[PDB]
Q: What sequence folds into this?
RNA sequence: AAAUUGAAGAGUUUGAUCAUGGCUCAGAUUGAACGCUGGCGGCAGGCCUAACACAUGCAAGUCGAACGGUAACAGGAAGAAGCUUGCUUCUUUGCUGACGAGUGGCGGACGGGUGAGUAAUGUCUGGGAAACUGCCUGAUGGAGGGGGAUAACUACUGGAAACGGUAGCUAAUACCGCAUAACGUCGCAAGACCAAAGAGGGGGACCUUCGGGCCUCUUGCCAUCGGAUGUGCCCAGAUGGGAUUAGCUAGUAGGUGGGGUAACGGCUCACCUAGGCGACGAUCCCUAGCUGGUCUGAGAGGAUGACCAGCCACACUGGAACUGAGACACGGUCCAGACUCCUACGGGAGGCAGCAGUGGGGAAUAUUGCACAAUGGGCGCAAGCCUGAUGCAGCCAUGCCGCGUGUAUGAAGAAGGCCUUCGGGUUGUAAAGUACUUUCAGCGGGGAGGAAGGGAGUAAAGUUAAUACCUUUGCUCAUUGACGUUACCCGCAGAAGAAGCACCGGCUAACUCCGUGCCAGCAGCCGCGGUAAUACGGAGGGUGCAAGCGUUAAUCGGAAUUACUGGGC
RNA sequence: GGCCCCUUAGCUCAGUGGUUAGAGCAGGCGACUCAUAAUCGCUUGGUCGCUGGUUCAAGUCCAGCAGGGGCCACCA
């Protein structure tokens, strides 16, 4: 055998979001092809990505796809997200780990409900930087309507605290760029330049016990069980012993092997998406929603008190109060679990714009400590968000 | 591997002081000996053959402080030798180190002797022995280490055990606190309130 | 194969068979010529065939292609067969 | 002197009794599994089920002192950058040390894995005669002279690759004749016939085509008779269940002749004779590797073959043979078959019941680790190379053994629970209080043994023409440990970091309150619960074990309940 | 990760959104009995799995979960 990884260029995470069938797999293939064309060696293909039968039979996307490229400033890892309205959990998982986002809007169709949903869940998970890239400019090239489309997308971004009147917009078609013409791949270069310029380098805090959320579970034949995820804070090394704490009972194992894009990493620093092989674990034991942490770092919890703000009106959400017996889906880190809530003496009603104090109990315990940011969503509608106040 | 609770309850059950305390006072002013422990102490129901055998075995075990596995191994070994099994068992349990340390006046009780032995403070034939149940053979010199000769407990118990009978086979100089064996002991030198044939019966079932 | 030490051995083994087959064929041919000589009834021919058959089998036994007892059996059986007839 | 000291009963058939007869219990053990709980070390053990399918990486090579040579590396000269005229820079030599690929030798049949097949083609005990045997060892001898080839290499060339083909050239300890021959083969005899390989060290007496000749020493090379080891062959007895399996056999039983094997033999053929095995169980069907031994028992017996040692069988499935002293050959060859891969579509490759590892099956069984330091093994004169054997480390309360979780004194017989006769009793010297010790773990400091040898130097004695090479003995000089931060010893602060599980009607050690009310439930066997439960559920108290404690599975004992020792009609 | 399914009294089951969801076998109470069975004299019973939505109006139309069941992928 295997090739090692050369820790020379900075690492960052990017992702793509937008309405269905606005060319998100095509854009990723075009950008990786162009970047490898100018300088590099990635040059990914289309059908090699969508391997599932339903992917090629229905012409859709069901999950998030991982890719890599680099520029002579940094090294970027890219995630490709679905756009439907019933594969939301995958998109939340994709947006949670991504530092930067690119939003795809077509001038033919314009902004669509799914774009608004994607922006709202990106805000509720807290993606700091979003760059908009217009799509399908080959079939429409009239200056007198692209201005209206740009105004609409700027309004959508500005409605929810994002910088909209200063964020740039790139116009181009991914199909022509992937085709390989002589001029439509310069828009890809402009997108990459604005990507590097608009994403300042974030902190790399590797000075506390290792913690890793789990997002996907794999069985490498011959070798064994592998978990996948992006290291949050800390550092892990081959031969160290970690512990699995989550919905099921706590266990322990050892990090006997690390990899990243099938390229070996000697030691994973905080902020890298890697896969870890764990000794002597059957596949069904470890599931997404659990945590893999250094011993003596966090412990599970069941009931705790927090401050929750139901989303105010004219912002989405809902329109009615809630009371005892309400069972909304808490979204914490990556996990969605429905639990019970309790409001103190008085303030029985819930008003859209009043932030109240709640105590929530969850059926499946999670590795939780004071000061965690969790959102609230149920019934295909996100209702609010809050932070931890007290652990009980 | 020891007992870590109340001490007088064992003698209150056995119906006899089992020498578990030093002897600064008398037993009668520490516990109600004739009253068995707990809510049910006054009544004295009648035993059986199994009852008397078990009670005697428990009595000897609580006197010397040996758990069941070692006692059973002792019984097998005593039956393994040549001669009577009861005398052999008594000789085997009388020839272990902490018992000799207690009988030579160096400890207040068996537990004091056990702390002294297990805290590496005794030389047997010049070398350090740490183990409570170290079997001892004739002609072995036993002494304290020179670092521990300034303790107060050992000097307190040195001039407190001469009220008890002087053993006829542990020749001791209390000045340089040096002791020696001469040979094995015998039933002539051991107390008369044990019927070893009950133990032999109990382990022959 | 896969260990680069038995391939050599296979090569010598096939060469050895190819070299041994010719000697076995020649020796068998001479012995069966002797048998045919007895068959015809010509005692002089059989005797002569035995006379120049003896060196062949003896030299081959010394080379090791056969065993001393094998050559001895051939020689003795042929001597008895020839000396029976006249 | 010792190698023996050995034999226990209880509950349950009836209103009560004696007898017969089954059921249950108290002991010892295990490659164990599940539930609750969990401090340390020493020595052991760890896929019992799918002989189900396998990704990846290691597990068998060595000899230049047999040979032809120089692919890589290290040892000289002249040209030749500038001169401190060789400071420094670059290119040309297989003469030397070493050595990739190639001929040749030895090993690869040992070591390691598994128990599928196999009821006697095997194993165990006791005998025998018709055989061969590398390496090791003894004795007596030979060791003369020739010849034709080929790999690598050179030129051309086929092919996706694996792998080829064509034309020349070269070396031997490669191969083939010849020369002589026995104590050897055949043969009554007379006679006829068969072998060989050379290398390396040092050089005095004596010469060179200056290749070496020439002397000695170490090692080989061939023939015959012995020793040792090893293997092949034969006979007798012992080696599970079924008679709801009674007849089986034609190469079958023997004889003559030919052939075949290292050797006897229906081992194989042609012909002759008509026999052979079987109620002392042949034939037929089911299950199963055997032994030294292990568990149990007072013995006689019963059950059994996990660890270690001897033997046997197998190597994806079915066949066959070449090579060799040894195989019809675990990591070889040929063919067929079922699976998995590469392919340019013509064709190619693979076999974890070797060490780790993966999926699946299951109540259930472990790391893709370190090193040749030591013991053995292959190759070599030695140095030395290789060894997932082996020596260690890791994971698991799976087993046996050892140690700790403090030691004293202390009545106010304290609060607090529980019971009460309301008087009081109990938990209980237990606690809290006061005075001492530091096992183990924590930190620091010092520090055995497994290490024998190998190398270098020097001297004496040996054989020879020789102070020479070489050998022996002594002596002298610096080095060889993965385990390893070994075992072990010393110092520091502080009781400081460390107790659970089952049971309490009788069998069987240990008793009272509240709740329920033939409900909820318990149960190894008799048996409990119907509104006053020592048997259910909770609490207080008590008993038995203890880093373990219980439940399930399986074997002998008790069972004189298959009765030989030792029973009945 | 994706799609399709089942959830009414103790057991078995009905219940086509207009106003308290019904049937059977069960069960409790009062007499009688040491306590029942049988004969009598009265008969109580419900989170329509949960949560949140639309309708004037809902277990019933709509969405997300709880648990089980049948298939389909995925390979640091
Ligand atoms: N001419 C042109 N065609 C385009 C452009 N973008 C996409 N397409 C075409 O639309 C087709 C489907 O678009 P696709 O890339 O699947 O959209 P998507 O958003 O990635 C689908 P999902 O949301 O499930 O990931 C593609 O085959 C592509 O050829 C564009 O900018 N120009
Ligand atoms: C971003 C995840 C990728 C695939 C990673 N190299 C593996 O796993
Ligand atoms: Mg896609
Ligand atoms: Mg004690
Ligand atoms: Mg004790
Ligand atoms: Mg004995
Ligand atoms: Mg006995
Ligand atoms: Mg018994
Ligand atoms: Mg021919
Ligand atoms: Mg009896
Ligand atoms: Mg009994
Ligand atoms: Mg009975
Ligand atoms: Mg009765
Ligand atoms: Mg009986
Ligand atoms: Mg017994
Ligand atoms: Mg357990
Ligand atoms: Mg249990
Ligand atoms: Mg458990
Ligand atoms: Mg397995
Ligand atoms: Mg097996
Ligand atoms: Mg087996
Ligand atoms: Mg297999
Ligand atoms: Mg390999
Ligand atoms: Mg050479
Ligand atoms: Mg030389
Ligand atoms: Mg030479
Ligand atoms: Mg040689
Ligand atoms: Mg070199
Ligand atoms: Mg040369
Ligand atoms: Mg040379
Ligand atoms: Mg060398
Ligand atoms: Mg070589
Ligand atoms: Mg060998
Ligand atoms: Mg075996
Ligand atoms: Mg075996
Ligand atoms: Mg036998
Ligand atoms: Mg020649
Ligand atoms: Mg070519
Ligand atoms: Mg020659
Ligand atoms: Mg020739
Ligand atoms: Mg000759
Ligand atoms: Mg020659
Ligand atoms: Mg010689
Ligand atoms: Mg052998
Ligand atoms: Mg016998
Ligand atoms: Mg047997
Ligand atoms: Mg014959
Ligand atoms: Mg042969
Ligand atoms: Mg035979
Ligand atoms: Mg079998
Ligand atoms: Mg077996
Ligand atoms: Mg036997
Ligand atoms: Mg026996
Ligand atoms: Mg016995
Ligand atoms: Mg008996
Ligand atoms: Mg015995
Ligand atoms: Mg006996
Ligand atoms: Mg005995
Ligand atoms: Mg066996
Ligand atoms: Mg086995
Ligand atoms: Mg064995
Ligand atoms: Mg062994
Ligand atoms: Mg195999
Ligand atoms: Mg085969
Ligand atoms: Mg197969
Ligand atoms: Mg041969
Ligand atoms: Mg193999
Ligand atoms: Mg294996
Ligand atoms: Mg496995
Ligand atoms: Mg399983
Ligand atoms: Mg287990
Ligand atoms: Mg290893
Ligand atoms: Mg091993
Ligand atoms: Mg356990
Ligand atoms: Mg242990
Ligand atoms: Mg113990
Ligand atoms: Mg009190
Ligand atoms: Mg009180
Ligand atoms: Mg040493
Ligand atoms: Mg009991
Ligand atoms: Mg019990
Ligand atoms: Mg009992
Ligand atoms: Mg019992
Ligand atoms: Mg009792
Ligand atoms: Mg009970
Ligand atoms: Mg019962
Ligand atoms: Mg009661
Ligand atoms: Mg009770
Ligand atoms: Mg135990
Ligand atoms: Mg049992
Ligand atoms: Mg049993
Ligand atoms: Mg019997
Ligand atoms: Mg009985
Ligand atoms: Mg009888
Ligand atoms: Mg009769």
A:
């Amino acid at each position: 055998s295997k090739e090692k990884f050369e820790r020379t260029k900075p690492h960052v995470n990017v992702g793509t979001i937008g309405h269905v069938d606005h060319g998100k797999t095509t854009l990723t293939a075009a950008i990786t092809t162009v970047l490898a064309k100018t300088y590099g060696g990635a040059a990914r293909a289309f059908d090699q990505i969508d391997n599932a039968p339903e992917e090629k039979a229905r012409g859709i996307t069901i999950n998030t796809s991982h890719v890599e490229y680099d520029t002579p400033t940094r090294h970027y890892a890219h995630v490709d997200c679905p756009g439907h309205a019933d594969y939301v959990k995958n998109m939340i998982t994709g947006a949670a780990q991504m530092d930067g986002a690119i939003l795809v809007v077509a001038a033919t169709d314009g902004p669509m409900p799914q774009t608004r949903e994607h922006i709202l869940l990106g805000r509720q998970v807290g993606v700091p930087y979003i760059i908009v890239f217009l799509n399908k400019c080959d079939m429409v090239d009239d200056e007198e309507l692209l201005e209206l489309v740009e105004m609409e997308v700027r309004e959508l971004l500005s409605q929810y605290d994002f910088p909209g009147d200063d964020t740039p917009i790139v116009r181009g078609s991914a199909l022509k760029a992937l085709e390989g013409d002589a001029e439509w791949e310069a828009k890809i270069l402009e997108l990459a330049g604005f990507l590097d310029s608009y994403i300042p380098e974030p902190e790399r805090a590797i000075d506390k016990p290792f913690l890793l959320p789990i997002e996907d579970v794999f069985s490498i034949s011959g070798r064994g069980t592998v978990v996948t995820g992006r290291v949050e804070r800390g550092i892990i090394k081959v031969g160290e012993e970690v512990e699995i704490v989550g919905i099921k009972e706590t266990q322990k194992s050892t990090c006997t092997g690390v990899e990243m894009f099938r390229k070996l990493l000697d030691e994973g620093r905080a902020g890298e998406n890697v896969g870890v092989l764990l000794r002597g674990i059957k596949r069904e034991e470890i599931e997404r929603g659990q945590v893999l942490a250094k011993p003596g770092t966090i412990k599970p919890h069941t009931k705790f008190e927090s401050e929750v703000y139901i989303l105010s009106k004219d912002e989405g959400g809902r329109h009615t109060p809630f009371f005892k017996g309400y069972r909304p889906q808490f979204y914490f880190r990556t996990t969605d679990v429905t639990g019970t809530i309790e409001l103190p003496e008085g303030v029985e009603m819930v008003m859209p714009g009043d932030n109240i104090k709640m105590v929530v109990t969850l059926i499946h315990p999670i590795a939780m400590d004071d000061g965690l940011r969790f959102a609230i969503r149920e019934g295909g509608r996100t209702v609010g968000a809050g932070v931890v106040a007290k652990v009980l | 591997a020891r007992y870590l609770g109340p001490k007088l309850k064992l003698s209150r059950r056995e119906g006899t002081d089992l020498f578990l305390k030093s002897g600064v006072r008398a037993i009668d002013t520490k516990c109600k000996i004739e009253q068995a422990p707990g809510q049910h102490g006054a009544r004295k129901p009648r035993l059986s053959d199994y009852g008397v055998q078990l009670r005697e075995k428990q009595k000897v075990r609580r006197i010397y402080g040996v758990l069941e596995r070692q006692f059973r191994n002792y019984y097998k070994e005593a039956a393994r030798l040549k001669g009577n099994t009861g005398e052999n068992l008594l000789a085997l349990l009388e020839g272990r180190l902490d018992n000799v340390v207690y009988r030579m006046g160096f400890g207040a009780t068996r537990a004091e002797a056990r702390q002294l032995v297990s805290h590496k403070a005794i030389m047997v034939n010049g070398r350090v022995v740490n183990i409570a149940s170290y079997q001892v053979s004739p002609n072995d010199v036993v002494s304290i280490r020179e670092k521990a000769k300034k303790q107060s407990r050992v000097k307190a118990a040195l001039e407190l055990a001469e009220q008890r009978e002087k053993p006829t086979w542990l020749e001791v100089d209390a000045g340089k606190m040096e002791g020696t064996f001469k040979r094995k002991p015998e039933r002539s030198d051991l107390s008369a309130d044990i019927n070893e044939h009950l133990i032999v019966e109990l382990y022959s079932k | 194969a896969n260990i680069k030490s038995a391939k050599k051995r296979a090569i010598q083994s096939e060469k050895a068979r190819k070299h041994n087959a010719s000697r076995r064929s020649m020796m068998r041919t001479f012995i069966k010529k002797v048998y045919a000589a007895i068959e015809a009834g010509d005692k002089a021919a059989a005797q002569k065939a035995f006379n120049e058959m003896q060196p062949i089998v003896d030299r081959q036994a010394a080379k090791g292609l056969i065993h001393k007892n094998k050559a001895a059996r051939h020689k003795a059986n042929l001597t008895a067969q020839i000396n029976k007839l006249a």
Observations:
- The longest helix of chain C spans residues 6-40.
- Chain C has one domain: 1-86.
